[PDB]
């Protein structure tokens, strides 16, 4: 994790990720209107202020 925090059911998620055989990602298609999606912190540094 990059931002300071922790998961819950950490070992359960880790075991299902080890048994995953890799990750295939589908774009969930969530389009957000009325608000902004640009939140970032200095803890994550890709080219400066970034986030996930």
């Amino acid at each position: 994790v990059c931002y300071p925090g922790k998961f819950v059911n950490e070992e359960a998620l880790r075991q299902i990720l080890r048994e995953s055989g890799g990750i295939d990602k589908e774009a969930m298609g969530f389009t957000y209107s009325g608000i902004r999606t640009n939140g970032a912190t200095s803890s994550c540094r890709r080219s400066g202020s970034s986030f996930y």
Partner: antibody
Framework: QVQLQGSGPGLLRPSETLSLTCSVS????????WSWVRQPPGKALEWIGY???????NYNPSLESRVTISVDRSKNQFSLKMTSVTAADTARYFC?????????????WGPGTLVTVSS | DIVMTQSPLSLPVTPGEPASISCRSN???????????LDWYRQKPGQSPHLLIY???NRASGVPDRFSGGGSGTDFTLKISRVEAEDVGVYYC?????????FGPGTTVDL
């Protein structure tokens, strides 16, 4: 915020295969699955069918066989083709996405590609 | 095929009054989550429509305060608090439960 844009032939004779195209920005047919509608001229509006961005298709039991929705993964425009066109199907095709499939952000309905079916 | 029953037909509204249009079908409309799939549309003639209310009871994005219409069960009603000059346009209500999708006959509201 995606931007939808449609294009295609207007003066078309009946019976032959119809062509249509529709360009989008932003989502790039990579995340959400778009659908299709059809506008009778000053009559009741109805729905054509949805196509998953992957390619799975579903339609209206009013009309199945004549409609073929293009997938077009690589190019950033998804298209529509109709066979056996009719002067009763002289319509104002709209190109869009809808609330209820999972996205709750309006429709971003594309412009009206007006078509006329006459000899 | 779920045939959609709009009511009423047309609203010759006066400027500045609370108006309302109902919407019902021959089914109970409820999703598995508990959130009803009902939409409210607004098509200016000669131009693409717009959504004003989504998910039944819920305020939509980019939509100001005069539209928050709800209801109960399978008959819902869009409420319009103030009538102004730009409220002309044909209105549609729409389910989202299952295929197929049947739009409404239309509500030609005018002054």
């Amino acid at each position: 915020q995606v931007q939808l844009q449609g294009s295609g032939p207007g003066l078309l004779r009946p019976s032959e295969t119809l062509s249509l195209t529709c360009s989008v920005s932003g989502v790039s047919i990579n995340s959400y699955y778009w659908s299709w509608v059809r506008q009778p001229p000053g009559k009741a509006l109805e729905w054509i069918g949805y196509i998953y961005y992957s390619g799975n298709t579903n339609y209206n039991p009013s009309l199945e066989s004549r409609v073929t929705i293009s997938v077009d993964r690589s190019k950033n425009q998804f298209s529509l083709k109709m066979t056996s066109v009719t002067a009763a199907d002289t319509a104002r095709y709209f190109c869009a996405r809808q609330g209820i499939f999972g996205d709750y952000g309006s429709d971003y309905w594309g412009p009206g590609t007006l078509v006329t079916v006459s000899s | 095929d779920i045939v959609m029953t709009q009511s009423p037909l047309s609203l010759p509204v006066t400027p500045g009054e609370p108006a309302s249009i109902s919407c019902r079908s021959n089914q109970s409309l409820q999703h598995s989550n508990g959130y009803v799939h009902l939409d409210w549309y607004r098509q200016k003639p000669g131009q693409s429509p717009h959504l004003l209310i989504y998910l039944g009871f819920n305020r939509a994005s980019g939509v100001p305060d005069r539209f928050s219409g709800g209801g109960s069960g399978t008959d819902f009603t869009l409420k319009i608090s103030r009538v102004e000059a730009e409220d002309v346009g044909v209105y549609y209500c729409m389910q989202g439960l299952q295929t197929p999708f049947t739009f409404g006959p239309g509500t030609t509201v005018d002054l």
